[PDB]
């Protein structure tokens, strides 16, 4: 099975001749056995070059070549998919851009597969990437590294160290030189110390002058010091001991004072273990150097740092490198680590050499899986480009101060077999077009539709520190990419080029640190986009937001592609970008689309993660300018064009039915702008969680009529979070930090500190927000945070069909909805869209009114006297029927429309139009059905106007009164406007009447009344045909009315001086009010309690509530919540829950509560009463003195009998069994302070627990993997 175990292989050894060219032709079945340096290698005519492997994995081979050119049946094998390569091989691609000559199709520094070429590489199978099963605070410690040093801190400097957490509890300086009162506060300091607290001391300047014998006795007693009895003048001394630890828990030293020097330091150092197995050393010192008396401490991690992971990583080896991602807004918080030899590590742990500088989440935070991804980079098959210490030549050096010209791999069409697996690709790619670390160029169908038995696959590579892209797909369908890692590369990491690439499946792939590039406009950052005008027209200055700044980790230029189990852990702009090309571009720019892209239904999208990005997590909009730079459109070719309207239909056929695009199990957090932006017709986002984003989710469509007739936009079974317990880390270019909304803690923020954080944004529509839950949305005095809101600075449409249903709000959600105010982010808040903000509360889950509509407070076109003023939301709650009217005006530009309802004439609405850049500006206010309005202008009357009835049911109607000069003839026509072909069908004319009263009798007749006194052209707008679903227009078209005026009066057509109070009617109520219902519905919210990226493993949400003294007086109980079960208890004592770890849903086998009296009986029950393999949940309440259980916690998980002590409450989660999980934890506190509200997540049905495998765990992801294969 092995390719090197081929007997026909000759052993090869060419030498070190950088000018020796090599050609492997027919019969040349060579087996490389030693390091080599040749100019080139060309494998052709059936030649074979296999790397020689060993049964043990020791033969380190390093090839070095200007290039390798595989073609015409030639083969290059480094192991086989069945008999994999075991030693460490390396192919170094060298040669500068301007050194020697270059190839025609290829550049230099490459490995190039051609037609019929065989490139077969298969490295050592390792584990690609998993998640942190435990968090990792900076500097390796739970509460961080302490370093201190100061000159002339005279006296006895003291520090206390929590023996379980290595936290600095107290820091004090007792001037036992001058003041005898100080040697007295020092002795009383050591009397009230908890036993077992690590203590360190260091003489500052000169102690031993006012020091008392009662204190020197206390030091010898509490800490086991043998030398304190004889401290002297200007004598340095440092100690590190354990309170009540006897003499053997102590380590001390001393130095004399001679010739103004101590001849060296006086160091005291011991090692301890956190209760988490992490080792740390407490260090203290005091010395004299030529006169200075320094004194310092250092509490730091020692013997490497032990990391916790989700899955088994036994395949990782010392001397290999890994990477831990950012769990904060700045992607530059990802870090590199080198694996230490660890004999004491389990299957879910390794040891890293370095000290972490940042914070990396390893827990599920408030139901959102914020665990940091962790991936291995070192392989045994390496293909690397040779680079320089700094930039050179015209390799884009004004932007990069380093070499950006490495190697690249390139595979042409009609090849034989490409199968790359477990290969390391360092310093690959060039800043030249087509030169990418793995470049599949125009290969066509490469699966069962192209003729490949083994579909061409890329399995678990490692492409890091590359100079352009990571893997590029150039006009290739059906490719597979699996378990691959792309780190610190330029331009879009994973790249779908021309927008024709379909059937490609991306499974469980990871991408970090996607930095700006210089290739495409979309790849450039703000500085590069304003510089490279070499491809723009004339003196045009490119705009860096509308044409560039589109750096994405996953660039999907076509939707028919399957994205599963991936994770975009950081990017300069976006994490996953789905976009659409109007017609094929690039080198594929030519063949006609037989299925235009923005009509093709989305492939699979299931269980993805996106975080650490500045512009978006998942983005679905925009296109590429499919035209070169010209005089009518000077934008660069392939820049960003916001004129793409997704609208998926069957077979990409707009005459055929709609096909919804499913966004499933998206997890997205710590994004600076949007968590997800999705536009078009028929999109359903479900089972998704959004957290710590500036805006959680936004649904778009079009600004006038929807991009696809009948466009529903659903979000169901989702979860939103505002400011979770992921306080982030103020570092790694984290540009924003502020005050939390709830706890008012220092945390990192997405944008400026006054940005109103938002959960869901309403825009365009029609949008169905259902069965979703919002948590932790509190505003600060700076910003107006809210759960549900609207898009800022909106001027377009908003429909009253946007309904929010079955939504649940958390206890820390103070502002359910908000409509904006004049401020820094809303500006006027006075544009055409801001004024017409509205949604529909179907069931009464948002406002407490079954079937009620909500809009902005000062919008008087929707108000009847039964409404409820709401000032906090800046809104108003009412009920009725509502639609919209679109008013197009010609002949007059920059015109501002003023429309008023008769019933509230003192409250008109001045609109400013929609096309203040085009020639046909329309105005789109929202109205209440079966009412009368009037319209007036800030200028002369338009000679032609169209009235569209949008969202009208049959027989729904309003009366309208247009202001015209007293001197006008009219000609009014109705018709059905067919959206498809611009034709007007079934046209009817209007006939005048004598009075407003005669037209009222003829309400369903095509009649109009003109009041020459006021100038009002009255008529009735009534719909004849029916609607269907959510389409804005009727069955037989978009009903519209056309009014052709004939006048020469240039006067401001504003009749309100004359129209009222002549046509005033007393305000009435068509649809009356219900009553409130503060008390949530049964069913409100999302069914799922926790959203993880391993949906197959069931996670048990557990939540505690241990009040304090002011709350125990006020009566608040102590509660242990399990999946939503409040096991309440208020007696002073202990509540112990025994949960079966194999039951899903959980089966709690025993609940027990121990009073303060029978506290002594918990010793016994813990020793025996706990069934084997049983999850222990335990929380106390009140002053519990002497809990002789400090030692009884270790078999359940702990490392050493930690010290709760005193009378403080405690909370513990453990396991009675052989295994010792990573989630086991403990929370101690002083009495009366309590523990507040914490939240843990316990996985269930793990084979570590000792549970049987009832059935095979239904991995829904892998089912989508085998379905999309064939
Ligand atoms: C329908 O009725 C309106 C209203 O006319 C009313 O009744 C008469 C009796 C007068 O009292 C008016 O003041 C009332 O408002 C008519 O509008 C006015 O029409 C008259 C006659 O056409 C206009 O008087 C002229 O105005 C000229 C100014 O406009 C000219 O100059 C500009 C300058 O650029 C030029 O661009 C434009 O094309 C015009 O040619 C003025 O030069 C001239 O000497 C004469 O006085 C009066 O100005 C009109 N009002 C306004 C606001 O313009 C309508 O004309 C009438 N319909 C039709 C079809 O005629
Ligand atoms: C804007 O300018 C860019 C250049 O900066 C320009 O891109 C060029 O487009 C042409 C499109 O024809 C590309 O030419 C192709 O070259 C490949 C091989 O290199 C050929 O195989 C292609 O022909 C195939 O397609 C035909 C149609 O089916 C078949 O009949 C034929 O037999 C072949 O199968 C094609 O000739 C050219 O490579 C690019 N160049 C670059 C640098 O991208 C772009 O077209 C300009 N914009 C517009 C709108 O034209
Ligand atoms: C633009 O596209 C629109 C949508 O395709 C066109 O809309 C029109 O919509 C009406 C609906 O009110 C269609 O009415 C159809 O009526 C036929 C009945 O005719 C049948 O019988 C006669 C024999 O008497 C036969 O000659 C016909 O071919 C039919 O077989 C029904 O079968 C339909 O279900 C439907 O009710 C119109 O047909 C339809 N127009 C067309 C051209 O189909 C709009 O007309 C288009 N405008 C332009 C300018 O092309
Ligand atoms: C914690 O509490 C949660 C409360 O929501 C639990 O989550 C849900 O628990 C219910 C328990 O009834 C599960 O319902 C199961 O559904 C599966 C699958 O059938 C589904 O599909 C069919 C149609 O094919 C439909 O008719 C069913 O109603 C289901 O919707 C069945 O095999 C079971 O018999 C049972 O009906 C939910 O599926 C589950 N929600 C999920 C998994 O998202 C949770 O289990 C509790 N325990 C934990 C988290 O450990
Ligand atoms: C490790 O993670 C923890 C948890 O987020 C971080 O702990 C926080 O550290 C800050 C230090 O600036 C504490 O602020 C101060 O705490 C003292 C002691 O109670 C208090 O008297 C001050 O008023 C101030 O609040 C903060 O309390 C603490 N978190 C909590 C919940 O108390 C820590 O910063 C992370 N990193 C390291 C290196 O420890
Ligand atoms: C790749 O090679 C195949 C095989 O030669 C080409 O497929 C065609 O296969 C049919 C089978 O009946 C032959 O009759 C044709 O002569 C083959 N060639 C052509 C041009 O049709 C295929 O065209 C090749 N593709 C490329 C891009 O070279
Ligand atoms: C938003 O509300 C509209 C109107 O209330 C809903 O449209 C109704 O849908 C039902 C189907 O369940 C139809 O039977 C009714 O005829 C529709 N019109 C009504 C009640 O006036 C719509 O389903 C809601 N959701 C969306 C996304 O539009
Ligand atoms: C309700 O709010 C509007 C908005 O300004 C205000 O004009 C009106 O007086 C208020 N009425 C009541 C009864 O609060
Ligand atoms: C429990 O521990 C305390 C230590 O504070 C000790 O005094 C007491 O005697 C212990 N309990 C029993 C029953 O000995
Ligand atoms: Cl209970
Ligand atoms: Ni290519």
Numbering used by the authors: 112 to 1381
Task: List passages from the publication reporting this PDB structure.
Transmembrane protein 2 (TMEM2) is a cell surface protein that has been reported to degrade HA into ~5 kDa fragments and play an essential role in systemic HA turnover. Recently, two homologous proteins that are not members of the HYAL family have been implicated in extracellular HA degradation: CEMIP (cell migration-inducing and hyaluronan-binding protein, also called KIAA1199 or HYBID) and TMEM2 (transmembrane protein 2). The two proteins share the same domain structure (see below) but differ in one important respect: CEMIP is a secreted protein, whereas TMEM2 is a type II transmembrane protein in the plasma membrane 3 . Subsequent studies showed that TMEM2 is essential for systemic HA turnover 6 and that it regulates cell adhesion and migration via HA degradation at focal adhesion sites 7 .
We expressed the soluble ectodomain of human TMEM2 (residues 106-1383; sTMEM2) with a N-terminal hexahistidine tag in Expi293 cells. We collected a high-redundancy X-ray diffraction data set (deposited in the PDB, see Underlying data) to 3.5 Å resolution and solved the structure by molecular replacement using the AlphaFold model of TMEM2 9 . Nearly the entire ectodomain (residues 112-1381) is resolved in the crystal structure, which matches the AlphaFold model with a root-mean-square (r.m.s.) deviation of only 1.1 Å (1270 Cα atoms). The sTMEM2 structure is built around a 70 Å-long right-handed parallel β-helix that starts at the N terminus. A small β-sandwich and a larger lectin-like domain (26% sequence identity to the N-terminal domain of protein O-linked-mannose β-1,2-N-acetylglucosaminyltransferase 1 (POMGNT1) 20 ) are inserted into the β-helix after three complete turns without disrupting its regular structure. The β-helix is followed by a large β-sandwich that is not closely related to any other known structure (termed domain X). The polypeptide chain then runs halfway down the β-helix before forming a second lectin-like domain (20% identity to POMGNT1) and, finally, a C terminal helix. The majority of active sites are located roughly in the middle of the β-helix, which in sTMEM2 is obstructed by two long loops, made up of residues 627-662 and 733-756. The three key sugar-binding residues of POMGNT1 are conserved in TMEM2, suggesting that lectin-like domain 1 may bind carbohydrates. We found that pure, crystallisable, soluble TMEM2 has no detectable hyaluronidase activity.
